[PDB]
Design an enzyme around this catalytic site. Structure first.
Site, PDB file in Angstrom:
ATOM      1  N   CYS A   1      45.774 -16.258 -50.678  1.00 13.19           N
ATOM      2  CA  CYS A   1      44.744 -15.274 -50.977  1.00 13.19           C
ATOM      3  C   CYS A   1      45.052 -14.430 -52.225  1.00 13.19           C
ATOM      4  O   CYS A   1      44.150 -13.827 -52.804  1.00 13.19           O
ATOM      5  CB  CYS A   1      44.512 -14.370 -49.766  1.00 13.19           C
ATOM      6  SG  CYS A   1      43.947 -15.253 -48.292  1.00 13.19           S
TER       7      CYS A   1
ATOM      8  N   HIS B   1      42.945  -5.183 -50.823  1.00 18.38           N
ATOM      9  CA  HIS B   1      42.578  -6.541 -50.472  1.00 18.38           C
ATOM     10  C   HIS B   1      41.462  -6.439 -49.446  1.00 18.38           C
ATOM     11  O   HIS B   1      40.455  -7.138 -49.546  1.00 18.38           O
ATOM     12  CB  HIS B   1      43.776  -7.294 -49.894  1.00 18.38           C
ATOM     13  CG  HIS B   1      43.635  -8.782 -49.953  1.00 18.38           C
ATOM     14  ND1 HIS B   1      43.136  -9.439 -51.057  1.00 18.38           N
ATOM     15  CD2 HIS B   1      43.936  -9.743 -49.047  1.00 18.38           C
ATOM     16  CE1 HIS B   1      43.131 -10.740 -50.828  1.00 18.38           C
ATOM     17  NE2 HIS B   1      43.611 -10.951 -49.615  1.00 18.38           N
TER      18      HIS B   1
ATOM     19  N   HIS C   1      35.345 -12.862 -48.585  1.00 22.45           N
ATOM     20  CA  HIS C   1      36.684 -13.206 -49.048  1.00 22.45           C
ATOM     21  C   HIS C   1      36.774 -14.639 -49.561  1.00 22.45           C
ATOM     22  O   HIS C   1      36.716 -15.597 -48.788  1.00 22.45           O
ATOM     23  CB  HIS C   1      37.721 -12.978 -47.945  1.00 22.45           C
ATOM     24  CG  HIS C   1      39.128 -13.243 -48.374  1.00 22.45           C
ATOM     25  ND1 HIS C   1      39.509 -13.291 -49.704  1.00 22.45           N
ATOM     26  CD2 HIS C   1      40.254 -13.477 -47.660  1.00 22.45           C
ATOM     27  CE1 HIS C   1      40.799 -13.543 -49.783  1.00 22.45           C
ATOM     28  NE2 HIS C   1      41.279 -13.659 -48.554  1.00 22.45           N
TER      29      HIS C   1
END
Lengths: 193, 434, 289, 145, 48, 48
Positions: free
Chosen positions: B133, B285, B326
């Site tokens: 990620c 994040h 995401h």
């Protein structure tokens, strides 16, 4: 992929699996509860799409392979790790251990001279996690039982991530180059950087 | 042994997807390219073009000021080439006709390789991080690294990933993705289900896309006379450590705040004459997962606490994952993009998906979660942002971003005035080209 | 089923369908979070001078105070400089508000209010109850986010210290809802974390009860003319079961606490012929007494 | 009287033709005081962002930033999204203008919001998965035992 | 040569230094990452 | 008249004629009552 020309003979299936059958075909498939056994019959009509097993002969009969009889277990990797992780992971994990063995052993000895956030991991891949990738795309389309951690284990960075979790425990940088065939030298470049 | 066709019903009915009707063809990509390359390639290819369009167009104009071997490409992926991968493993086992270039096109580096072949034509560095990620911020770190050592004077940093079938089933199996059947049961619409720091946060929404940024030497940017979007004051990736526990999240991103006045975070600021209080915004994040949000909050709370952040001068934090969802590979770049746009416009974007702040987060006093946009006008400036991203397997990262006008102060009044002249002329010519 | 429909009509079976479920509930107990965002919005947007009565009203709304909210106010105030006139007024007023926050006290009231919706008498009562440091159960017929966003707006304004607000989907026309709601209102106040998330039903013994639920005449299904018959269940009979319901909880869980039910009587029956609804229906409240 | 007042309407003449469009994007500077030395900082050792772009659920960096900060698109916001979503096409055939790509109808810049944005919002951002792969994970995903 | 023969060189760590005392170390978790010079003593065999 | 309009829209002074406003002007030249005194575009019809 082949189209069924005439209705296939009924087969017994569970209610959950048979309802699923209906979700693809539904004009072309037929499913019924069996009153006594509560399960369902699955009958494919004409016009359904079937995938029928076949074979192929290929050109490459030879490759350069790690000597037969290699085990991560002999090196001392626990069975739980061997299961949960891709084959490519066993390669980088043991290599890292033997790489340290050139100088020091305990990875935390680095934390004596250095603050843990100053430990970096630059590890390249052309693809990496190949097995774990081919394991999902087969397995899912095949509905076979396959591991839940698949996409985590297919990330080309996850392999040294596994090593950092299991061994060094550094608090610092992690980079994972893709150089195709050149990742190795490309990795050194960034390790230097 | 026979393999007989069946079906399955799955939990995830919703994802964050590029607007319906998108075509690389409309942008002007040739049909031959569209065929031969993975879908993920079309994302990084068009993004690179539009990334250049911010300043210059013809990629060879770089070769006027710079020797081609000084052009670098640092481009991250969590996976990348996903379609081309799933295309081989289906196709081969299925004997269907599939392309011969498959394994070349599944290399996560091949996508920007395609861009270098088609567009820039640089003779210089190519690096391709895997940060799970965190690749995006991890990519910026190495893009920064390539310049300072003189290996390359111009780099392209970024990340990209795609959303396909078996990407979904990997997350949903891993339990990390929010279960749509449960969201509808709680009366949650598709737009409202990604909520960062919320009490009810159920896990992340998976997305697709890609983004890139052009990082350059400060001296070159003035000399070429391009726009300066922001100064990257620092970039770092950070691991965590040995533990057995699966929910236990990586805290290692704290290593940047170590040392106080001697810390990398504060010294980066101090070199611009900027203090620790002068970071107004952190881009979290903010995965909306129950594991990441409070941990990243505790992390940002602590990095401020030890560096002597004035009590109750909280970091105003935006969650872009509540909007864009995401996207694994291109996560921190979308945040990187938003942060530049934050600095120049001054505006701090809201989290509009926040119904209620998690009561656990009360313990963090250096952190403020804003549900409504705070728009900073000409009389209300801002200074420096921070992009933080936590990847899978102890991949954590931090990118300190600082306002462009901090750099213009090092030119002396004569040259400072001379630069504004060039930058003004470029903007007019830039608006033209765009 | 055809005979049953023939007697009762078309609208009655369709409107009596169940609504309430225990999993859709939403609890807002945070003042600490909403007070901080409330202050910074004032501080930035400050225009009007010290002569404003709104500053005194907002100071009473900012009266919610603890170690958490003080750490917010005491900071933005101490960070404020002598730069301008607004900065001189803000710094002084904030320091005074920070001092008044330290000594701030609270009250407690547990209330259940129905018919609390926007632009109504009860909505003005709700925010005022929240202004009095109470704990309020607020029911809404429409569960849509436009109604949900309103109560969030109403709470983040009028909430004091010790104040906790609760918003739920509710239908007073359903006996199932009434039974299920108070079964939720009366159980535990416990949250069990196992492998999964289970919230045991929150138990707060109601001090005040406000049956302001007010069905309006909208006849799209053709229901016209039968409504005054059905509302007699809602306005009285279902209230009776609502009163009986909270009486059971109080007796079973054994409280001597008296629930104060304010009966929304219509003004002066018999001296108005023009209302057509209020005047006649509420005269049986004397019989209910 | 009041129902009648509500029942008695009237039309005050309103003649209006409205359009939507804008100048190229500008930048609003911020007021910042800086006491600094010039020659001290090495420009060769600094990293600076020249430009950037993104492709995502909300479109490019321009349209995504509009949706994030504002929550609604401007004239250029809907015009760009309708172009990216492929609602509007450009023909050199006579009438020479912007045309709707689906129905083949000429469009101006004003009606872009009215004719499209309602459908744009639905089919952009986050929504139910539209199947471009002839497979639905949530509904039916092919299995072989 | 000790590693090659015995199968020793791979030991998967329990992470003793992380959790060593349940109550304080979870509290000390913050304090460790915050201050620069905090490290491992060798004498206790690598304690945090 | 020119000043009156472009005072209301000062942005008209700093920007480009919109790419969709170019065909409109060339279109107006073709429908104009008395033929245009200049050449708006170099193209196949330049002789006309």
């Amino acid at each position: 992929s082949v189209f069924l020309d005439k209705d296939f003979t009924f087969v017994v299936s569970s209610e959950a699996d048979a309802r699923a059958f209906v979700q693809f075909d539904p004009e072309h498939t037929v499913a019924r509860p069996l009153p006594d056994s509560s399960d369902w019959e699955v009958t494919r009509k004409a016009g359904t799409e079937i995938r029928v097993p076949r074979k192929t002969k290929l050109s490459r009969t030879v490759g350069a392979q790690i000597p037969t009889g290699f085990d991560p277990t002999v090196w001392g990797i626990s069975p739980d790790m061997a299961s949960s992780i891709d084959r490519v992971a066993l390669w980088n994990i043991v290599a890292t251990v033997d790489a340290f063995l050139s100088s020091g052993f305990t990875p935390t000895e680095l934390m004596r001279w250095v603050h843990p956030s100053q430990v970096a991991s630059t590890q390249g891949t052309g693809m990496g996690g190949m097995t774990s990738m081919q394991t999902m795309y087969h397995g899912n389309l095949l509905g076979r039982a396959k591991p839940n951690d698949i996409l985590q284990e297919v990330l080309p960075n996850v392999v040294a991530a596994h090593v950092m979790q299991s061994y060094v425990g550094g608090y610092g940088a992690m980079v994972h180059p893709v150089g195709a065939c050149a990742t190795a030298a490309v990795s050194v470049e960034e390790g230097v950087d | 042994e026979i393999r007989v066709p069946r079906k399955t019903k799955l939990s995830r009915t919703v994802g964050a997807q590029i607007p319906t009707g998108f075509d690389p063809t409309v942008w002007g990509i040739s049909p031959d390219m569209a065929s031969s390359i993975d879908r993920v390639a079309l994302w990084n290819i068009v993004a690179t073009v539009d990334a250049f369009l911010s300043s210059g167009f013809t990629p060879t104009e770089l070769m006027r000021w710079v020797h081609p071997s000084q052009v670098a490409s640092t481009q991250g992926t969590g996976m990348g080439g996903m379609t081309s991968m799933q295309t081989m493993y289906h196709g081969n086992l299925l004997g269907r006709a599939k392309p011969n270039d498959i394994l070349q096109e599944v290399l996560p580096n091949v996508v920007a390789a395609h861009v270098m072949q088609s567009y820039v034509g640089g003779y210089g560095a190519m690096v391709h991080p895997v940060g799970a990620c965190a690749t995006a911020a991890v990519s910026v770190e190495e893009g920064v690294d390539k310049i300072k050592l003189g290996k390359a004077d111009l780099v392209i940093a970024g990340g990209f990933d795609d959303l396909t079938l078996e990407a979904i089933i990997g997350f949903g199996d891993m339990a990390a993705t929010a279960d749509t059947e449960m969201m509808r049961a709680k009366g949650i619409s598709d737009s409202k289900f990604s909520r960062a720091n919320d009490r009810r946060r159920l896990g992340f929404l998976e997305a697709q896309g890609g983004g890139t940024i052009l990082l350059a030497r400060g001296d070159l940017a003035l000399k070429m006379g391009l726009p300066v979007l922001a100064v990257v004051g620092y970039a770092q990736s950070f691991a965590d450590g040995v533990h057995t526990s699966i929910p236990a999240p990586g805290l290692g991103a704290l290593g940047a705040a170590r040392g106080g006045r001697e810390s990398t975070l504060a010294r980066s600021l101090a070199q611009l004459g900027v203090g620790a209080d002068d970071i107004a915004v952190i881009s979290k994040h903010d995965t909306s997962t129950l594991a990441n949000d409070p941990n990243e909050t505790e992390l940002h709370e602590r990095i401020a606490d030890s560096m002597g952040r004035a009590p109750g001068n909280p970091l105003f934090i935006v969650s872009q994952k509540t909007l864009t969802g995401h996207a694994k590979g291109g996560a921190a770049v979308f945040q990187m993009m938003g942060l530049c746009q934050i600095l120049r416009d001054g505006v701090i974007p809201p989290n509009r998906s926040l119904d209620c702040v998690d009561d656990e987060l009360a313990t963090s006093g250096h952190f403020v979660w804003v549900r409504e946009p705070l728009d900073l006008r000409g009389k209300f400036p801002l200074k420096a942002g921070l992009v933080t991203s936590l990847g899978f397997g102890h991949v954590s990262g931090l990118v300190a971003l600082v306002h462009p006008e901090a750099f213009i102060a090092a030119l002396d009044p004569s040259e400072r005035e001379d630069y504004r002249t060039r930058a003004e002329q470029r903007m007019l010519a830039g608006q033209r080209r765009l | 089923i055809d005979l049953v429909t023939a007697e009762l009509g078309s609208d009655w079976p369709r409107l009596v369908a169940p609504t309430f479920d225990a999993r859709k509930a939403v609890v807002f107990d945070d003042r600490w979070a909403s007070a901080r965002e409330d202050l910074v919005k004032l501080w930035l947007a400050e225009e009007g001078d010290i002569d404003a009565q709104w500053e005194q009203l907002s100071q009473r709304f900012e009266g919610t105070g603890h170690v958490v909210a003080t750490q917010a106010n005491w900071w933005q105030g101490k960070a404020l400089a002598a730069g301008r006139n607004v900065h001189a007024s803000l710094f002084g007023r904030i320091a005074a508000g920070a001092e008044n926050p330290g000594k701030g006290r609270y009250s407690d009231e547990v209330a259940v209010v129905t018919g609390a919706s926007k632009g109504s008498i009860a909505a003005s009562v709700v925010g005022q109850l929240l202004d009095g440091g109470a704990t309020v159960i607020a029911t809404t017929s429409r569960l849509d986010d436009d109604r949900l966003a309103f109560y969030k707006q109403l709470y983040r304004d009028h909430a004091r210290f010790d104040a906790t607000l609760w918003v739920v989907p509710a239908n007073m026309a359903s006996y199932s809802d009434i039974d299920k709601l108070v079964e939720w209102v009366g159980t535990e106040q416990t949250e069990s974390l196992g492998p999964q998330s289970i919230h045991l039903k929150d138990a707060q013994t109601p001090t005040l009860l406000f049956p302001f639920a007010a069905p309006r005449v909208a006849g799209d299904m053709s229901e016209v003319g039968s409504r005054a018959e059905m509302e007699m269940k809602v306005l009285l009979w279902a209230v009776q079961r609502l009163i009986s319901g909270l009486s059971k909880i109080g007796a079973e869980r054994d409280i001597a606490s008296r629930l104060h039910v304010v009966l929304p009587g219509s003004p002066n029956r018999g001296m108005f012929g023009g209302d057509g609804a209020y005047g006649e229906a509420k005269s049986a409240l004397d019989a209910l007494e | 009287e009041m129902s009648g007042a509500a029942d008695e309407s009237d039309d005050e003449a309103p003649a209006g033709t409205i359009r939507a469009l804008p100048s190229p994007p500008r930048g609003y500077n911020p007021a910042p005081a800086p006491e600094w030395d010039d020659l001290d900082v090495d420009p060769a050792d600094l990293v600076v962002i020249v430009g950037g772009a993104e492709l995502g659920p909300y479109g490019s960096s321009r349209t995504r930033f509009e949706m994030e900060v504002s929550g609604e698109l401007s004239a250029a916001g809907v015009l760009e999204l309708a172009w990216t979503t492929g609602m509007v096409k450009w023909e050199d055939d006579p009438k020479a203008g912007w045309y709707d790509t689906e129905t083949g109808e000429l469009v101006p810049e004003c009606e872009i919001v009215e004719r499209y944005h309602d459908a744009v919002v639905e089919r952009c951002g986050i929504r139910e998965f539209v199947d471009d792969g002839a497979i639905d994970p949530d509904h039916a995903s092919p299995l072989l035992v | 040569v000790s590693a090659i023969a015995g199968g020793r060189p791979m030991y998967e760590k329990p992470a003793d230094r992380r959790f060593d005392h349940d109550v304080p170390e979870k509290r000390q978790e913050a304090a460790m990452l915050l201050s620069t010079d905090a490290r491992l003593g060798e004498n206790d065999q690598y304690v945090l | 008249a020119i000043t009156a309009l472009l005072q209301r829209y000062p942005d008209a002074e700093t920007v480009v004629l919109h790419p969709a406003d170019v065909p409109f002007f060339v279109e107006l030249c073709k429908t104009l009552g008395k033929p245009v005194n200049f050449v708006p575009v170099i193209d196949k019809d330049v002789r006309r």
